[PDB]
mmCIF file of C-alpha atoms in Angstrom:
data_model
loop_
_atom_site.group_PDB
_atom_site.id
_atom_site.type_symbol
_atom_site.label_atom_id
_atom_site.label_comp_id
_atom_site.label_asym_id
_atom_site.label_seq_id
_atom_site.Cartn_x
_atom_site.Cartn_y
_atom_site.Cartn_z
ATOM 1 C CA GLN A 1 87.622 59.018 103.653
ATOM 2 C CA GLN A 2 90.999 57.579 104.558
ATOM 3 C CA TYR A 3 93.145 55.006 102.752
ATOM 4 C CA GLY A 4 92.207 51.379 102.602
ATOM 5 C CA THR A 5 88.456 51.891 103.175
ATOM 6 C CA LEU A 6 87.392 49.074 100.908
ATOM 7 C CA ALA A 7 89.882 46.651 102.488
ATOM 8 C CA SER A 8 88.625 47.556 105.980
ATOM 9 C CA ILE A 9 85.019 46.797 104.900
ATOM 10 C CA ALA A 10 86.134 43.490 103.444
ATOM 11 C CA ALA A 11 88.116 42.639 106.595
ATOM 12 C CA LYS A 12 85.247 43.407 108.927
ATOM 13 C CA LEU A 13 83.048 41.083 106.868
ATOM 14 C CA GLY A 14 85.615 38.404 106.060
ATOM 15 C CA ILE A 15 85.234 38.925 102.293
ATOM 16 C CA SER A 16 87.508 40.250 99.543
ATOM 17 C CA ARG A 17 88.078 43.871 98.673
ATOM 18 C CA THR A 18 86.824 43.060 95.184
ATOM 19 C CA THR A 19 83.657 41.674 96.826
ATOM 20 C CA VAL A 20 83.183 45.083 98.455
ATOM 21 C CA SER A 21 83.889 46.839 95.108
ATOM 22 C CA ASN A 22 81.319 44.753 93.238
ATOM 23 C CA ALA A 23 78.789 45.991 95.801
ATOM 24 C CA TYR A 24 79.387 49.437 94.237
ATOM 25 C CA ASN A 25 80.276 48.818 90.562
ATOM 26 C CA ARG A 26 78.977 45.317 89.725
ATOM 27 C CA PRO A 27 75.857 44.637 91.935
ATOM 28 C CA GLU A 28 74.910 41.612 89.844
ATOM 29 C CA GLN A 29 78.066 39.793 90.990
ATOM 30 C CA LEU A 30 76.619 39.162 94.459
ATOM 31 C CA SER A 31 73.337 38.449 96.235
ATOM 32 C CA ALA A 32 70.989 41.293 97.264
ATOM 33 C CA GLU A 33 71.680 40.304 100.845
ATOM 34 C CA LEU A 34 75.486 40.575 100.798
ATOM 35 C CA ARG A 35 75.310 43.838 98.821
ATOM 36 C CA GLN A 36 73.061 45.328 101.473
ATOM 37 C CA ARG A 37 75.355 44.083 104.243
ATOM 38 C CA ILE A 38 78.414 45.639 102.504
ATOM 39 C CA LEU A 39 76.502 48.904 102.032
ATOM 40 C CA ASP A 40 75.255 49.086 105.647
ATOM 41 C CA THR A 41 78.708 48.187 106.985
ATOM 42 C CA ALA A 42 80.013 51.116 104.872
ATOM 43 C CA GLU A 43 77.351 53.279 106.430
ATOM 44 C CA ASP A 44 78.304 52.294 109.947
ATOM 45 C CA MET A 45 81.783 53.360 108.946
ATOM 46 C CA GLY A 46 80.716 56.802 107.762
ATOM 47 C CA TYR A 47 81.745 55.927 104.239
ATOM 48 C CA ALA A 48 73.993 74.372 95.246
ATOM 49 C CA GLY A 49 75.573 77.525 93.837
ATOM 50 C CA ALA A 50 78.952 79.427 93.917
ATOM 51 C CA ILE A 51 80.912 81.669 96.220
ATOM 52 C CA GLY A 52 83.537 84.227 95.338
ATOM 53 C CA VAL A 53 86.775 85.710 96.711
ATOM 54 C CA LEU A 54 87.646 89.285 95.900
ATOM 55 C CA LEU A 55 91.387 89.696 95.517
ATOM 56 C CA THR A 56 92.767 93.208 95.202
ATOM 57 C CA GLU A 57 95.756 91.653 93.371
ATOM 58 C CA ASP A 58 96.587 89.967 90.072
ATOM 59 C CA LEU A 59 94.849 86.597 89.793
ATOM 60 C CA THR A 60 98.329 85.021 89.930
ATOM 61 C CA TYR A 61 98.660 86.109 93.550
ATOM 62 C CA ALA A 62 96.114 83.506 94.608
ATOM 63 C CA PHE A 63 98.519 80.815 93.356
ATOM 64 C CA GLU A 64 101.984 82.314 93.864
ATOM 65 C CA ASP A 65 101.749 83.994 97.271
ATOM 66 C CA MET A 66 102.026 80.918 99.470
ATOM 67 C CA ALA A 67 100.298 82.623 102.499
ATOM 68 C CA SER A 68 97.273 83.266 100.254
ATOM 69 C CA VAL A 69 97.349 79.732 98.851
ATOM 70 C CA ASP A 70 97.166 78.403 102.384
ATOM 71 C CA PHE A 71 94.253 80.755 103.075
ATOM 72 C CA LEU A 72 92.427 79.650 99.891
ATOM 73 C CA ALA A 73 92.986 75.993 100.798
ATOM 74 C CA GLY A 74 91.006 76.856 103.903
ATOM 75 C CA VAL A 75 88.230 78.486 101.919
ATOM 76 C CA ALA A 76 88.266 75.465 99.593
ATOM 77 C CA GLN A 77 87.768 73.190 102.625
ATOM 78 C CA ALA A 78 84.715 75.113 103.922
ATOM 79 C CA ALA A 79 83.142 75.261 100.472
ATOM 80 C CA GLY A 80 82.780 71.665 99.551
ATOM 81 C CA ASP A 81 81.087 71.045 96.201
ATOM 82 C CA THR A 82 80.680 74.810 95.913
ATOM 83 C CA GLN A 83 82.185 76.547 92.864
ATOM 84 C CA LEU A 84 84.822 79.059 93.986
ATOM 85 C CA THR A 85 85.174 82.194 91.854
ATOM 86 C CA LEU A 86 88.316 84.280 92.206
ATOM 87 C CA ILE A 87 87.618 87.944 91.398
ATOM 88 C CA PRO A 88 90.702 90.023 90.377
ATOM 89 C CA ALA A 89 90.219 93.593 91.563
ATOM 90 C CA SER A 90 92.668 96.316 90.622
ATOM 91 C CA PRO A 91 94.381 98.078 93.563
ATOM 92 C CA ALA A 92 95.194 101.172 91.415
ATOM 93 C CA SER A 93 94.287 104.643 92.726
ATOM 94 C CA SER A 94 92.572 105.293 89.367
ATOM 95 C CA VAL A 95 89.723 102.935 90.099
ATOM 96 C CA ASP A 96 86.422 104.670 90.641
ATOM 97 C CA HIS A 97 83.046 103.397 91.828
ATOM 98 C CA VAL A 98 81.640 102.720 88.332
ATOM 99 C CA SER A 99 84.601 100.474 87.565
ATOM 100 C CA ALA A 100 84.349 98.632 90.876
ATOM 101 C CA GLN A 101 80.567 98.281 90.640
ATOM 102 C CA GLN A 102 80.696 96.715 87.136
ATOM 103 C CA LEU A 103 83.264 94.190 88.307
ATOM 104 C CA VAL A 104 81.202 93.327 91.395
ATOM 105 C CA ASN A 105 77.775 93.270 89.709
ATOM 106 C CA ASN A 106 79.143 90.854 87.107
ATOM 107 C CA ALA A 107 80.409 88.336 89.673
ATOM 108 C CA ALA A 108 78.070 85.345 89.417
ATOM 109 C CA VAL A 109 78.187 84.491 93.092
ATOM 110 C CA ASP A 110 75.797 84.080 96.063
ATOM 111 C CA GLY A 111 78.416 85.453 98.467
ATOM 112 C CA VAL A 112 81.876 86.902 98.700
ATOM 113 C CA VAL A 113 84.893 86.419 100.908
ATOM 114 C CA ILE A 114 86.746 89.750 100.883
ATOM 115 C CA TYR A 115 90.427 89.009 101.184
ATOM 116 C CA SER A 116 92.901 91.573 102.499
ATOM 117 C CA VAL A 117 91.445 94.687 100.885
ATOM 118 C CA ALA A 118 92.328 98.275 101.789
ATOM 119 C CA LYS A 119 90.028 100.256 104.015
ATOM 120 C CA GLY A 120 88.062 102.632 101.767
ATOM 121 C CA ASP A 121 88.400 100.384 98.726
ATOM 122 C CA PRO A 122 85.587 101.125 96.239
ATOM 123 C CA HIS A 123 85.016 97.407 95.739
ATOM 124 C CA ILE A 124 83.847 97.144 99.382
ATOM 125 C CA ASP A 125 81.221 99.856 98.654
ATOM 126 C CA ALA A 126 80.270 98.121 95.415
ATOM 127 C CA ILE A 127 79.631 94.873 97.289
ATOM 128 C CA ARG A 128 77.495 96.723 99.848
ATOM 129 C CA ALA A 129 75.482 98.452 97.129
ATOM 130 C CA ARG A 130 74.720 95.058 95.622
ATOM 131 C CA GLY A 131 73.717 93.694 99.035
ATOM 132 C CA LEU A 132 76.000 90.694 98.568
ATOM 133 C CA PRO A 133 76.499 88.648 101.765
ATOM 134 C CA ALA A 134 80.143 89.168 102.628
ATOM 135 C CA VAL A 135 82.762 88.206 105.169
ATOM 136 C CA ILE A 136 86.097 90.030 105.497
ATOM 137 C CA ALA A 137 89.495 88.391 106.197
ATOM 138 C CA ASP A 138 92.575 90.278 107.455
ATOM 139 C CA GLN A 139 91.153 93.647 106.426
ATOM 140 C CA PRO A 140 89.284 96.021 106.258
ATOM 141 C CA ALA A 141 88.144 95.996 109.889
ATOM 142 C CA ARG A 142 84.993 97.656 111.162
ATOM 143 C CA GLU A 143 82.762 97.421 108.080
ATOM 144 C CA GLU A 144 79.093 97.320 108.978
ATOM 145 C CA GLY A 145 77.209 94.088 108.221
ATOM 146 C CA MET A 146 80.466 92.290 107.230
ATOM 147 C CA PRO A 147 81.825 89.666 109.709
ATOM 148 C CA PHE A 148 85.579 90.042 110.303
ATOM 149 C CA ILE A 149 88.257 87.314 110.848
ATOM 150 C CA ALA A 150 91.858 88.222 111.643
ATOM 151 C CA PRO A 151 94.631 88.123 114.217
ATOM 152 C CA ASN A 152 95.552 91.234 116.218
ATOM 153 C CA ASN A 153 98.488 92.454 114.144
ATOM 154 C CA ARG A 154 99.692 95.177 116.423
ATOM 155 C CA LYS A 155 100.054 92.437 119.023
ATOM 156 C CA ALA A 156 101.098 89.477 116.863
ATOM 157 C CA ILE A 157 104.146 91.369 115.659
ATOM 158 C CA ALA A 158 105.384 92.292 119.156
ATOM 159 C CA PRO A 159 107.223 88.944 119.726
ATOM 160 C CA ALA A 160 109.246 89.547 116.590
ATOM 161 C CA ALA A 161 110.373 93.118 117.243
ATOM 162 C CA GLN A 162 110.982 92.169 120.914
ATOM 163 C CA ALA A 163 113.181 89.251 119.857
ATOM 164 C CA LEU A 164 115.254 91.671 117.890
ATOM 165 C CA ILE A 165 115.640 94.034 120.861
ATOM 166 C CA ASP A 166 116.509 91.143 123.144
ATOM 167 C CA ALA A 167 119.502 90.358 120.900
ATOM 168 C CA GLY A 168 120.678 93.942 121.389
ATOM 169 C CA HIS A 169 119.845 95.264 117.907
ATOM 170 C CA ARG A 170 119.169 99.009 117.720
ATOM 171 C CA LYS A 171 119.983 99.817 114.079
ATOM 172 C CA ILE A 172 116.849 98.176 112.716
ATOM 173 C CA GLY A 173 115.196 98.575 109.319
ATOM 174 C CA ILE A 174 111.599 97.600 108.431
ATOM 175 C CA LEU A 175 110.154 96.220 105.181
ATOM 176 C CA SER A 176 106.500 96.254 104.091
ATOM 177 C CA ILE A 177 104.203 95.482 101.229
ATOM 178 C CA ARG A 178 101.407 97.802 99.925
ATOM 179 C CA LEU A 179 100.473 100.536 102.423
ATOM 180 C CA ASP A 180 98.072 102.543 100.228
ATOM 181 C CA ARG A 181 96.359 102.978 96.806
ATOM 182 C CA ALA A 182 98.872 105.545 95.511
ATOM 183 C CA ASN A 183 101.798 103.504 94.207
ATOM 184 C CA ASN A 184 105.020 103.723 96.174
ATOM 185 C CA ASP A 185 108.294 101.792 96.054
ATOM 186 C CA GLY A 186 111.203 102.455 98.368
ATOM 187 C CA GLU A 187 111.311 104.931 101.255
ATOM 188 C CA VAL A 188 108.073 105.258 103.164
ATOM 189 C CA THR A 189 107.360 108.704 104.612
ATOM 190 C CA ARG A 190 105.706 109.397 107.945
ATOM 191 C CA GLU A 191 102.729 110.786 106.082
ATOM 192 C CA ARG A 192 102.233 107.701 103.866
ATOM 193 C CA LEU A 193 102.451 105.505 106.970
ATOM 194 C CA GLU A 194 100.134 107.585 109.119
ATOM 195 C CA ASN A 195 97.505 107.752 106.317
ATOM 196 C CA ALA A 196 98.049 104.132 105.227
ATOM 197 C CA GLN A 197 94.684 102.512 104.373
ATOM 198 C CA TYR A 198 96.103 99.033 104.232
ATOM 199 C CA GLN A 199 95.661 98.054 107.871
ATOM 200 C CA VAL A 200 97.787 94.993 108.764
ATOM 201 C CA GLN A 201 100.777 96.588 107.071
ATOM 202 C CA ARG A 202 100.251 99.828 108.973
ATOM 203 C CA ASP A 203 99.429 97.989 112.176
ATOM 204 C CA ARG A 204 102.377 95.514 111.954
ATOM 205 C CA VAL A 205 104.683 98.462 111.365
ATOM 206 C CA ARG A 206 103.142 100.322 114.290
ATOM 207 C CA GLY A 207 103.227 97.389 116.729
ATOM 208 C CA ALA A 208 106.890 96.693 115.907
ATOM 209 C CA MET A 209 107.750 100.378 116.191
ATOM 210 C CA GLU A 210 105.986 100.493 119.573
ATOM 211 C CA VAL A 211 108.309 97.792 120.878
ATOM 212 C CA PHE A 212 111.332 99.639 119.559
ATOM 213 C CA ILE A 213 110.224 102.928 121.153
ATOM 214 C CA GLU A 214 109.976 101.163 124.523
ATOM 215 C CA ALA A 215 113.534 99.985 123.938
ATOM 216 C CA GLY A 216 114.685 103.576 123.522
ATOM 217 C CA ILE A 217 115.066 103.654 119.762
ATOM 218 C CA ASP A 218 113.882 106.931 118.237
ATOM 219 C CA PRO A 219 111.305 106.247 115.438
ATOM 220 C CA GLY A 220 112.883 108.746 113.062
ATOM 221 C CA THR A 221 116.054 106.635 112.972
ATOM 222 C CA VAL A 222 114.346 103.447 111.755
ATOM 223 C CA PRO A 223 114.158 103.384 107.939
ATOM 224 C CA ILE A 224 111.006 101.918 106.386
ATOM 225 C CA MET A 225 110.872 100.699 102.762
ATOM 226 C CA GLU A 226 107.989 99.187 100.759
ATOM 227 C CA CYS A 227 107.200 97.386 97.535
ATOM 228 C CA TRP A 228 103.738 98.198 96.140
ATOM 229 C CA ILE A 229 103.657 94.903 94.230
ATOM 230 C CA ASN A 230 104.465 91.734 96.251
ATOM 231 C CA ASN A 231 106.665 89.644 93.932
ATOM 232 C CA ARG A 232 109.765 87.568 94.262
ATOM 233 C CA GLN A 233 111.469 90.198 92.063
ATOM 234 C CA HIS A 234 110.144 93.252 93.953
ATOM 235 C CA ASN A 235 110.850 91.697 97.361
ATOM 236 C CA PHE A 236 114.454 91.337 96.177
ATOM 237 C CA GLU A 237 114.747 94.887 94.844
ATOM 238 C CA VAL A 238 113.257 96.541 97.909
ATOM 239 C CA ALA A 239 115.640 94.468 100.091
ATOM 240 C CA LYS A 240 118.649 95.475 98.039
ATOM 241 C CA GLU A 241 117.794 99.172 98.214
ATOM 242 C CA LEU A 242 117.340 99.207 101.985
ATOM 243 C CA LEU A 243 120.520 97.324 102.804
ATOM 244 C CA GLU A 244 122.443 99.215 100.085
ATOM 245 C CA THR A 245 121.133 102.517 101.419
ATOM 246 C CA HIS A 246 121.624 101.742 105.145
ATOM 247 C CA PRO A 247 124.708 99.422 105.270
ATOM 248 C CA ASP A 248 124.984 99.984 109.021
ATOM 249 C CA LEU A 249 121.752 98.060 109.784
ATOM 250 C CA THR A 250 122.171 94.971 111.939
ATOM 251 C CA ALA A 251 118.610 93.649 111.655
ATOM 252 C CA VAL A 252 115.562 93.839 109.357
ATOM 253 C CA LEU A 253 112.008 93.207 110.538
ATOM 254 C CA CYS A 254 109.615 92.214 107.732
ATOM 255 C CA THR A 255 105.826 92.524 107.731
ATOM 256 C CA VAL A 256 105.491 89.371 105.691
ATOM 257 C CA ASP A 257 107.630 86.196 105.163
ATOM 258 C CA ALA A 258 107.839 86.919 101.416
ATOM 259 C CA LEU A 259 109.839 90.062 102.245
ATOM 260 C CA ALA A 260 112.169 88.108 104.505
ATOM 261 C CA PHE A 261 112.894 85.724 101.581
ATOM 262 C CA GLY A 262 113.708 88.696 99.368
ATOM 263 C CA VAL A 263 116.195 89.679 102.039
ATOM 264 C CA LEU A 264 117.714 86.188 102.031
ATOM 265 C CA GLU A 265 117.864 86.011 98.249
ATOM 266 C CA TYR A 266 119.553 89.404 98.404
ATOM 267 C CA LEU A 267 122.076 88.635 101.158
ATOM 268 C CA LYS A 268 122.901 85.495 99.111
ATOM 269 C CA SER A 269 123.699 87.564 95.969
ATOM 270 C CA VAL A 270 126.412 89.446 97.876
ATOM 271 C CA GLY A 271 127.957 86.473 99.640
ATOM 272 C CA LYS A 272 126.334 87.246 103.025
ATOM 273 C CA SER A 273 123.745 85.198 104.899
ATOM 274 C CA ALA A 274 121.502 85.363 108.011
ATOM 275 C CA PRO A 275 122.113 85.720 110.896
ATOM 276 C CA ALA A 276 125.905 86.231 110.781
ATOM 277 C CA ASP A 277 125.667 89.264 108.522
ATOM 278 C CA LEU A 278 122.096 90.271 109.344
ATOM 279 C CA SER A 279 119.298 89.303 111.706
ATOM 280 C CA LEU A 280 115.828 89.128 110.091
ATOM 281 C CA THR A 281 112.269 88.354 111.211
ATOM 282 C CA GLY A 282 109.209 87.354 109.221
ATOM 283 C CA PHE A 283 105.435 87.083 109.637
ATOM 284 C CA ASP A 284 103.033 84.317 108.367
ATOM 285 C CA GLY A 285 104.827 81.019 108.975
ATOM 286 C CA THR A 286 104.577 79.631 105.465
ATOM 287 C CA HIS A 287 105.886 76.139 104.745
ATOM 288 C CA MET A 288 109.078 77.603 103.199
ATOM 289 C CA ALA A 289 109.618 79.911 106.193
ATOM 290 C CA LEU A 290 109.545 76.936 108.569
ATOM 291 C CA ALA A 291 111.860 74.815 106.379
ATOM 292 C CA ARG A 292 114.522 77.565 106.562
ATOM 293 C CA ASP A 293 113.580 77.796 110.231
ATOM 294 C CA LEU A 294 113.093 81.561 109.795
ATOM 295 C CA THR A 295 112.373 83.552 112.943
ATOM 296 C CA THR A 296 108.778 84.564 112.397
ATOM 297 C CA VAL A 297 105.166 84.917 113.578
ATOM 298 C CA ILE A 298 103.025 81.874 112.811
ATOM 299 C CA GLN A 299 99.562 82.662 111.558
ATOM 300 C CA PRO A 300 96.953 79.895 110.970
ATOM 301 C CA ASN A 301 96.088 80.897 107.386
ATOM 302 C CA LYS A 302 94.296 77.734 106.396
ATOM 303 C CA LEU A 303 92.076 77.986 109.453
ATOM 304 C CA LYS A 304 91.485 81.660 108.692
ATOM 305 C CA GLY A 305 90.246 80.670 105.277
ATOM 306 C CA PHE A 306 88.118 77.822 106.594
ATOM 307 C CA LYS A 307 86.409 80.069 109.136
ATOM 308 C CA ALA A 308 86.001 82.675 106.385
ATOM 309 C CA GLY A 309 84.182 80.372 103.959
ATOM 310 C CA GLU A 310 82.186 78.724 106.785
ATOM 311 C CA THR A 311 81.111 82.131 108.078
ATOM 312 C CA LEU A 312 80.042 83.057 104.554
ATOM 313 C CA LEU A 313 77.999 79.901 104.003
ATOM 314 C CA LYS A 314 76.297 80.243 107.397
ATOM 315 C CA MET A 315 75.478 83.864 106.398
ATOM 316 C CA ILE A 316 73.916 82.768 103.103
ATOM 317 C CA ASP A 317 72.018 80.079 105.020
ATOM 318 C CA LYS A 318 70.648 82.755 107.425
ATOM 319 C CA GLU A 319 72.680 81.256 110.261
ATOM 320 C CA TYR A 320 74.243 83.210 113.128
ATOM 321 C CA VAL A 321 77.883 84.243 112.843
ATOM 322 C CA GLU A 322 80.082 86.239 115.181
ATOM 323 C CA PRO A 323 80.693 89.790 113.955
ATOM 324 C CA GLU A 324 84.352 89.647 114.908
ATOM 325 C CA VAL A 325 86.823 86.790 115.547
ATOM 326 C CA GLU A 326 90.422 87.159 116.582
ATOM 327 C CA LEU A 327 92.776 84.496 115.294
ATOM 328 C CA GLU A 328 95.615 83.573 117.621
ATOM 329 C CA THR A 329 99.227 83.556 116.365
ATOM 330 C CA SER A 330 102.336 82.009 117.940
ATOM 331 C CA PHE A 331 105.938 83.170 117.729
ATOM 332 C CA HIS A 332 108.505 80.841 116.101
ATOM 333 C CA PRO A 333 111.943 81.552 117.695
ATOM 334 C CA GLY A 334 113.580 80.148 114.607
ATOM 335 C CA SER A 335 117.288 80.458 113.682
ATOM 336 C CA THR A 336 117.858 84.005 112.366
ATOM 337 C CA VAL A 337 118.378 85.418 115.890
ATOM 338 C CA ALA A 338 121.987 86.011 116.941
#
């Protein structure tokens, strides 16, 4: 729309903004000819169902995890006057198909945007069994009949791990969020990582590790901790444990900006800061990350959401959509280098 629209219309016609307003709210205040002129001039100026989003997190996540809120803004922009229904799906390993299928079959939507769900998640199968048009964002990749939108994580993370190596860091630690259904906080074992169903996490860990290996670092020396639940409180805890357990670490590479902030809130509690005491990297590029000028990987989350919702709507409208789209990311040198 853009600010001052009524004033512009009045200016172009040499009348008052109230004159223009009356054309809309008080037609009787002016002649049928001036009303038409105001309306046409407005024209020259350019002046039904519901879709869902399956979140394998607590409904709060959609409003407290800033990366997800930027994504959803994007889905909100594609869907115009379309009702948007957030569907809270439990990520617990106890969930079976009957539970997932009842949740899904009771979602009053014409389509669903699957947001960052583990590969092999029973909700995915439930959606397929219902034949609900669906688009996937971030993960899971390679689902038949379900368009996929995401950046190449193994590659998008390279610039961050590389930046750490270029500053001569070798005692590096890694932090991640949920890697699998079976709950796990703290140390991540090779087995949990290798069998991780939460691609993105697994792939961002892998891509970073691949850059460290090329640097000479032996994988077994790089500690990897995780927090099953992604909270401000858990991000803090998992950061304390890693730095408290491996005090010799000079840098910490995070799979998500949130984790980096848990590392900053932790360093802060012990009088330290970053860099100086510790070099850290993030991934996402949230508004807060950029304000702190955190070294991180910028990901266009709002665009990812817009393409997601658009792809969904075109699907429901029997339009053509690309089966796979790779979103580009860009490294943000930031100021947590040293």
